Design a protein around this nucleic acid. Sequence first.
DNA 1: GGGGTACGTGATCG
DNA 2: CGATCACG
Length: 753
Amino acid sequence: AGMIIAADYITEDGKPIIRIFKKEKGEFKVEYDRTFRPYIYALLKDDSAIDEVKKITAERHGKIVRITEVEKVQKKFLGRPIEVWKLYLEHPQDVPAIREKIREHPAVVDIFEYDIPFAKRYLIDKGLTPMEGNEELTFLAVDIETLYHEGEEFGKGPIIMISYADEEGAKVITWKSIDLPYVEVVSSEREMIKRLVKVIREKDPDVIITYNGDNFAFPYLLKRAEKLGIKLPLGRDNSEPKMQRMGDSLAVAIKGRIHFDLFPVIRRTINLPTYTLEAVYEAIFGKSKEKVYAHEIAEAWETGKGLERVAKYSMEDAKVTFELGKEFFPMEAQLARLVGQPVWAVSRSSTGNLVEWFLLRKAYERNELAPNKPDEREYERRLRESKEPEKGLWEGIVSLDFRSLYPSIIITHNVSPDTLNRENCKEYDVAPQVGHRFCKDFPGFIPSLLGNLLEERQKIKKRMKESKDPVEKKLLDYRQRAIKILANSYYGYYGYAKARWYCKECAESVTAWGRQYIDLVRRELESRGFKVLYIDTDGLYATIPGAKHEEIKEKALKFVEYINSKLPGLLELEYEGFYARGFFVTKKKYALIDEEGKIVTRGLEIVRRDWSEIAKETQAKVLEAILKHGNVDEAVKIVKEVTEKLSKYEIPPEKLVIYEQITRPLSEYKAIGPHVAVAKRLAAKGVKVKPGMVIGYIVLRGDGPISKRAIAIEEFDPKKHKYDAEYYIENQVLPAVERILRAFGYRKEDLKY
DNA sequence: GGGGTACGTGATCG
DNA sequence: CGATCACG
Ligand SMILES: [Mg+2]
């Protein structure tokens, strides 16, 4: 079978050619389409206006741009028939050149579908879905180790090891002598990079797995390949990996392949305070992994002693990256297929953007004109548009999930922006408290799609019970899971300020109808002896005060079984889990500990390089005292001792360092924060300050804002300089612990002597 | 060989 | 305050 893995376009004689990358019975095939044309829609005041509108012109690449053909089309907008004009263009890059010239026009009411990338336009319009079929893909995990010294410019240090892994095993390429069976010793950094290029071209993997290869491995490989005057022909068309700007960070694509970066995937899928490969591997496979820190790698490389340890670490990084990629790719592949967009894009998207891509495709299928994304003004206005947890430390906490309730509410009440407050509506549903009216006269666009999604999931689930084949059961399990994830993202999407089908009234109405079921669950739990400690639209936490843990579990499992049997249709409550202890601060700010001693928090931990070690160490100690020791008095004593130690200059300066990256040329800064004031002084000294550089600084005692009192760590002398104890107490240590301790009745002022 | 693509949050500046 | 900036 022919499986689409990606799509893009190339220009030939100034004209666009769509490229469809396929895997057909184990073979890479590239299909070319020259006939598909770019277009936008324009809603005109009157049909007569088209004569003036079709004559609109623009300029691109020195040459003028024209509307190639115009077509009157009948579509649906806001659940109403609408007549719009399809404005065809020669090249997709013509659209950003001419769209505002068309929008400007006095006879143009509005323009639509003017920001849809050409390759995604093609996939939607041609009814093409990526990752369909039983086609078996090949995978290769790739990792690199670099020589790093404190605060160096990105790419100054050479790549010292390159590792890769597949089903054949994990291997290391290095340019220093190491006697291990899996180590390939080459002569230079140049020859090691060329060997990675050779491995990739020979193995010809369909998927390249990395752990943060978007921001580290590939940008570094590209930087070192540039310095060394060598190419990286990793694309199946011999093109080099392409760095793309996604937000403030990067995204790397390899043409004809899927660069599958696990880092954005795992960050979305699982909840951890740190996303180190070691923490992630232990969380998924329950196995320990050793870390070899940058300073240890530098010492081993420079001394030539203890290099076997470094090569074992590099080899394991690839081996576990391969194991994790194989664990997480099947789900990303089913989400790709379900939304009808490539894995590359889907693996790097929020669920809100997954819903939008599903909706855009379904809009084309149903002849529905898509609403536009908001302008800066509308986006801000949406962000402006508008139960309390139990205090103390609780034991034996049961977690219940409400999320599978909302798709059913959207369908039954026909909650959709196209059904909201319709004029001359015969029958409508009124939302409780909020009072929004949703027309019953026709099924809304979103309710209609959701119903089909939920029906399709029930069919898959029925096929799973009636299947004797463990292979299709595995594939169908990922399919029903992908639908559940997509369906449960619709509620959130109605409220997403960047959404096309954004509807505040829809989100409130679903919250209002949802609340009746939440109040039922809360009441039925409370009559069973349960105390509800935390409730949000997503779920709740409860316990039976002073009851045995097995009894809390048994009663909770019995309770979900009971409620689901009382709730009509596909309305479903889910038992998420059990926790030995936990405390709750506010909405989505809480911390729990499971029976295996794993701490799980939401909106509290500060495990980041721009927070000093003293603040992170104290916060970890406070959480451990509370969750592992069940002792809030110990936690308060920890803070009081640390702050006194800071007052008396008893804390080592290494625990006071703040790290912040330089992201621009120094002259481009508008606000000069401490790291920039320090960076400007270094540049003045002759230091090559470049974006990517990470500035380590300590805040000293004195007058003025912190920026004037910050010193570079390399300039800090414990004899001459005195750190600002008030800054480390009030701006570092106390903010790190004050939110946690507020759950127990302490204010900032109670945490000192 | 393309193209808009990321958020949610919290500190510090101006 | 809003604006700016950075983390993962
Ligand atoms: Mg590594």
